[PDB]
Amino acid sequence: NNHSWLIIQADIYFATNQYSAALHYYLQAGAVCSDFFNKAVPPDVYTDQVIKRMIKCCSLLNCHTQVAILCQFLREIDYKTAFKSLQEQNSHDAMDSYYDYIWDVTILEYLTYLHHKRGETDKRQIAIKAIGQTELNASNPEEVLQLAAQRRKKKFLQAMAKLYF
Amino acid sequence: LLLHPEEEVAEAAASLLAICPFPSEALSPSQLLGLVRAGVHRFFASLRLHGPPGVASACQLLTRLSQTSPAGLKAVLQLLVEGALHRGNTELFGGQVSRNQQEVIYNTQSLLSLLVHCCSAPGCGECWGAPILSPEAAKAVAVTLVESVCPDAAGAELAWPPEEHARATVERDLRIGRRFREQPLLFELLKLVAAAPPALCYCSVLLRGLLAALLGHWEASRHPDTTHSPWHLEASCTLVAVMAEGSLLPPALGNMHEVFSQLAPFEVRLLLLSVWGFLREHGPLPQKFIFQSERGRFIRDFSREGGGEGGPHLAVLHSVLHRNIDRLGLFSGRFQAP
Amino acid sequence: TCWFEFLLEESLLEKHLPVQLIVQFLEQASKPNKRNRILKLLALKVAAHLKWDLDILEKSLSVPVLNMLLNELLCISKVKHVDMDLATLPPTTAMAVLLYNRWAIRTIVQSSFPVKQQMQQEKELTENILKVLKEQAADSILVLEAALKLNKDLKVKTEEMQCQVCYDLGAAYFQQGSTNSAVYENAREKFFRTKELIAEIGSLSCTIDEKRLAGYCQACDVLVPSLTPYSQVHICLRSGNYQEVIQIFIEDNLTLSLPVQFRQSVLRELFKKAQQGNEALDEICFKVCACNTVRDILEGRTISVQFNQLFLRPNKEKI
């Protein structure tokens, strides 16, 4: 139950194209740092480099909805990678049901746009309902939005760590 | 193996695990979390098939898991509360979608006893004394409750809004009320949350929608008395009772649940609106509770707050009493200033 | 059967043998002198024909109409109330003065009573009237007290008048008592007083709510005691004799007489008193809790979190 060593071993499994193990031990370090993602993971452990290695591993495992939702964990939201991976149609991560973890209005708007382009009416309606949420509105006084971000971060991290362990 | 289908191997593994020591260094987060999920699954399944007698193994394990570390404590509390409130493991506790009540009380006994065991601080403290529930465990139960009932947490500020907000949040408040009527264990957990002093503040959203579903009901209750809505009367008394136990209300103002069975709906609605007004002028924030290290408990002292003894809000209550001296005259010994 | 018809004849009121007539006459008289005087006289006549029953007029007629009618009667009668003393006053003038003070105290009592939720002007006038009587409630209380004390002597029984005035004065004391407990003490005495009068005359005549007086007596018996198990537990908690308190609950489990929430609330108060100090109180909290636990078993209700918190370290004494 050290977090730096779970990170180190996640990186070691990462370099050797063991991306499932890299995700496993990245998530292990993250859940050690918080209390099962109940708290907020300290920024000095889930750093931008770690988030990027994780996002690459999730892409190579074809978990592209997970890629979109991970892309918003950075200090600046990396819209380009999430947009490209959301354009993928071969994903293995329960694309629609995972939408509750999207808190970015731009990313949801982009997803609704693809669903309109591809004719996925049910996923379009799901994305629209996700956008049509009062707490998700971009005009909230900077506190409902931050709390929404933290709670979606927590739910995402804990369901992810369940999938990997 | 605690997921293995045949029951005898499952119990044998569980009874090994309950007594088999955890590794000396620590439990890996994968190991810790897999053990915790297996333990709660055994506990829940042990109970579904055996009931209260046959869960001790799992319970021991879970308790042993819950004292491992705050990460394991929060994980087991969150997973036990979530599994208690899932569409499965809900019919054991009176959850909606006929079952015997007796078994429900005693299943709930096992679950709540486990939670108290996990929550309570280990380690003669007098011959009659009781161990102190920890604040943080009830805080975690509180946040898991609020995320299970009203996941948005759109009112995540603890200070209460003006009573005009209630008509802005009608759907959310009705959702919380519907959930509380559907799953009675919720109140038990609230009482458990209330059994620790501060954590009920972190359920404030719940309670605010809860009071407004109650207030809303008392809005539209056209019946001349209070007993034509049994569940709502019991929920309101339990809420004031839980708020008064959680020390969100003063003793004089919190005792009003005693008269609620002899009141008209508008009278109790004005009483609950005085509840709302008090919660507005004071608010459930953890900083007012002070840690008495002599007994080691968080205490809420209204006297130092200033006007905490219901300066004007007791005016409404006393006006109720005077209006109802014909029936509530004897009850007047419940709401005195001292 | 209208306002105009009644003002025409001087004897059609006898053929009518009323509160609607009162309010119509008052509204016509107050609409923006001989006709006004005649209407006021007719209103006084019908109000007297109602035998001066304050309850019916209070429930039918609103604050401003009845206030205007009584101000008018005080105008013809005497035309300051505190200094009159009603000693040298004629009996009709004295009864008018005491009736006005009684009505004022009754309305200031009924204003505090919570209720269900042109009109705006009437509300503003009622608010102004209530503020006026608030600024002069002490004078009305003193006048009622003097009238009760001065039992010198149409004409009705002095006992009925004194009983009604002391009952209203006691109600006013009870309403005042919410701010200050000591005032309650006075109320008790006066209530005891009317109790004696209630047992003295036994005459319906005047008419007071027996249930309300019984309730006031009950309330003063517990708030200011100076029987039932309920008040026994109240007295013992006031005294701190908790062992008989446990005994009373234990006897209750057989009868289930006390209300459940009373015991839940008293146990909660016991726990709250315990967590500050009085380390010996914890056993008490256990014991009552145990009975409550046991009681909660007999009615088929869940073991409280408090027993599950108490048996965490079981002991032979506990068991």
Swiss-Prot record, chain A:
Q: Which domain of life is it from?
A: Eukaryota
TPR repeats by residue range: 3-36
**What pairs make up the disulfide bonds?**
none
Annotated localization: Nucleus; Chromosome
Instruction: Name the disease.
Output: Neurodevelopmental disorder with cerebellar hypoplasia and spasticity: An autosomal recessive neurodevelopmental disorder characterized by global developmental delay, profound intellectual disability, seizures, absent speech, spasticity, facial and limb dysmorphism, and subtle structural brain abnormalities including cerebellar hypoplasia.
Tell me the domain comment.
The WFEF motif is required for the recruitment of protein phosphatase 2A (PP2A) to transcription pause-release checkpoint.
Assembly mode: Component of the Integrator complex, composed of core subunits INTS1, INTS2, INTS3, INTS4, INTS5, INTS6, INTS7, INTS8, INTS9/RC74, INTS10, INTS11/CPSF3L, INTS12, INTS13, INTS14 and INTS15. The core complex associates with protein phosphatase 2A subunits PPP2CA and PPP2R1A, to form the Integrator-PP2A (INTAC) complex.
Name the protein family: Belongs to the Integrator subunit 8 family.
Function, as annotated, reads: Component of the integrator complex, a multiprotein complex that terminates RNA polymerase II (Pol II) transcription in the promoter-proximal region of genes.
Name listed for the protein in its UniProt record: Integrator complex subunit 8
Q: What is the lineage of its organism?
A: Eukaryota, Metazoa, Chordata, Craniata, Vertebrata
- Placed within the complete protein, the shown segment runs 831 to 995 of 995
From Swiss-Prot, chain B:
Q: Which GO terms describe its biological process?
A: regulation of transcription elongation by RNA polymerase II; RNA polymerase II transcription initiation surveillance; snRNA 3'-end processing; snRNA processing
Which of UniProt's keywords are assigned here?
Answer: Acetylation, Cytoplasm, Membrane, Nucleus, Phosphoprotein, Transmembrane, Transmembrane helix
**Signal sequence annotation:** none
Which parts pass through the membrane?
185-205, 259-279
Predominant location category: nucleus
GO cellular component labels: cytoplasm; cytosol; INTAC complex; integrator complex; membrane; nuclear membrane; nucleoplasm; nucleus
Location(s), subcellular: Nucleus; Cytoplasm; Nucleus membrane
Give the multimer and partner information. Component of the Integrator complex, composed of core subunits INTS1, INTS2, INTS3, INTS4, INTS5, INTS6, INTS7, INTS8, INTS9/RC74, INTS10, INTS11/CPSF3L, INTS12, INTS13, INTS14 and INTS15. The core complex associates with protein phosphatase 2A subunits PPP2CA and PPP2R1A, to form the Integrator-PP2A (INTAC) complex.
Family per similarity comment:
Belongs to the Integrator subunit 5 family.
Task of the protein: Component of the integrator complex, a multiprotein complex that terminates RNA polymerase II (Pol II) transcription in the promoter-proximal region of genes.
What name appears for this protein in its UniProt entry?
Integrator complex subunit 5
Give the gene that encodes this protein.
INTS5
Curated annotation (Swiss-Prot), chain C:
Any domain commentary?
A: The WFEF motif is required for the recruitment of protein phosphatase 2A (PP2A) to transcription pause-release checkpoint.
Note the segments forming the TPR repeats: 163-201, 227-260
Shown chain mapped onto the complete sequence: 22 to 415 of 995
According to the entry, the disease involved is: Neurodevelopmental disorder with cerebellar hypoplasia and spasticity: An autosomal recessive neurodevelopmental disorder characterized by global developmental delay, profound intellectual disability, seizures, absent speech, spasticity, facial and limb dysmorphism, and subtle structural brain abnormalities including cerebellar hypoplasia.
Q: How does it assemble?
A: Component of the Integrator complex, composed of core subunits INTS1, INTS2, INTS3, INTS4, INTS5, INTS6, INTS7, INTS8, INTS9/RC74, INTS10, INTS11/CPSF3L, INTS12, INTS13, INTS14 and INTS15. The core complex associates with protein phosphatase 2A subunits PPP2CA and PPP2R1A, to form the Integrator-PP2A (INTAC) complex.
What does changing D209G do?
A: In NEDCHS; occurs in a splice site resulting in altered splicing and probable nonsense-mediated mRNA decay
Designated name of the protein: Integrator complex subunit 8
The gene that this protein is the product of is: INTS8
Ranges spanned by the short sequence motif WFEF motif, renumbered to the chain: 3-8
- Which family does the record assign? Belongs to the Integrator subunit 8 family.
Q: What does this protein do?
A: Component of the integrator complex, a multiprotein complex that terminates RNA polymerase II (Pol II) transcription in the promoter-proximal region of genes.
Q: Where in the cell is it found?
A: Nucleus; Chromosome
